[PDB]
Every structure is written in structure tokens, then in C-alpha cells.
Amino acid sequence: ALWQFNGMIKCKIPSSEPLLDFNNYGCYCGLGGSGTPVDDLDRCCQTHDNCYKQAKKLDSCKVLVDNPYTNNYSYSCSNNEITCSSENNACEAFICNCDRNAAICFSKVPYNKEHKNLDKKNC
Ligand SMILES: [Ca+2]
Ligand SMILES: [Cl-]
Numbered sequence: 001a002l003w004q005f006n007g008m009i010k011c012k013i014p015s016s017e018p019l020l021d022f023n024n025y026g027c028y029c030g031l032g033g034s035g036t037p038v039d040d041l042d043r044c045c046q047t048h049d050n051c052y053k054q055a056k057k058l059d060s061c062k063v064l065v066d067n068p069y070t071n072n073y074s075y076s077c078s079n080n081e082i083t084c085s086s087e088n089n090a091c092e093a094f095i096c097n098c099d100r101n102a103a104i105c106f107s108k109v110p111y112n113k114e115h116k117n118l119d120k121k122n123c
Contacts, residue, residue, distance in 0.1 A: 001070050005099040011077035012107035022106060026115045027123035035123035039112050044105035051098035060090035071095040 002019075009018040016022070024030045026042030028049055037043040052068040055061050061068070073092035074085035082103060084096035 001072065004073060004075055004096070005103070007077065008075065008082050008099050008103035009106060011080055011082050012103045014080065021111070021116075024117050026118055027120065032120075033123075035120075038115050038118065038122070040109035041106060041111060042115065044102055044109060047105065048098060048102035051101065052095075055091070055095050055098060058091060058094055061094065064089070064091050066091050066095075068095050068098070075100070 006018045009016060009022065022029050022041075022045075026038045026045060027033060027035045028037055028042050028045035030045075033046060033049045037046045055066070055068045055071075060066075071092055073088045073096040075096055076083050076085070082100045084093060084100055088096055
């Protein structure tokens with residue numbers, strides 16, 4: 001869900017307030033996402049959006065009537081490393097991996113503040 005994802009982002013980027021820094025960034029970071037990503041951070045968000053699309057197609061998630069946005073997976077953060085819980089079921093695990101991949105991606109790309117709060121006509 002959002003609470004775990006936000007915690008993962010802070011795990012990798014301890015200086016960030018994700019719900020303020022990454023939301024409404026570029027064409028993909030935040031609600032919806034379409035068009036050409038504007039930079040590598042936006043591509044991280046595009047990948048993440050696509051990972052959620054795939055989670056919704058996974059048989060485990062469908063049978064569990066899962067919503068990736070509300071998934072109740074478990075994770076831990078130690079020394080700025082994210083570990084998705086081994087106890088997560090297949091659906092939970094998939095979504096945890098989407099979130100972990102994105103948090104890692106965000107930590108590895110530049111932040112271009114000219115893309116914060118981008119007008120979606122640019123998308
Ligand atoms: Ca999005
Ligand atoms: Cl990690």
C-alpha cells in the first residue's frame with residue numbers, strides 16, 4: 001500500500017519526504033501516467049505504474065481480489081536496504097518487489113525539480 005511504499009522510499013532516500021517530493025513529478029509519478037517520460041525518475045515511475053498493471057493480471061492477485069494500491073505486504077528497512085518479507089504471499093511479494101524496485105530506482109536517478117508539478121499537457 002502507500003504507507004509501505006513511502007517507507008521504502010525513505011529507506012533508500014533518507015532525506016526525502018516522498019509524499020511531498022515524488023508525488024506529482026513528471027508525467028508518471030503520481031496519479032495516472034501517460035505520454036513520454038520526461039527523465040529517468042519519470043521512467044522509474046512509468047515502470048512502477050506498469051508493475052502495478054502486471055500485478056493486477058497475476059492469478060494470485062486476482063484470486064485474492066487484490067488491489068495493488070492497498071496491498072498489505074510486509075517489508076523491513078535495515079541500513080538503507082529494503083527486504084521484502086519472505087512471508088509475503090505471491091501477490092504481496094510481487095507488489096512488494098514493484099515498490100522496492102521503484103524505491104531503488106528513485107535513489108539512483110537525478111531529481112530535476114523543473115519536472116515537479118508538471119502540467120500534464122506535456123504528457
Ligand atoms: Ca503513476
Ligand atoms: Cl535495497
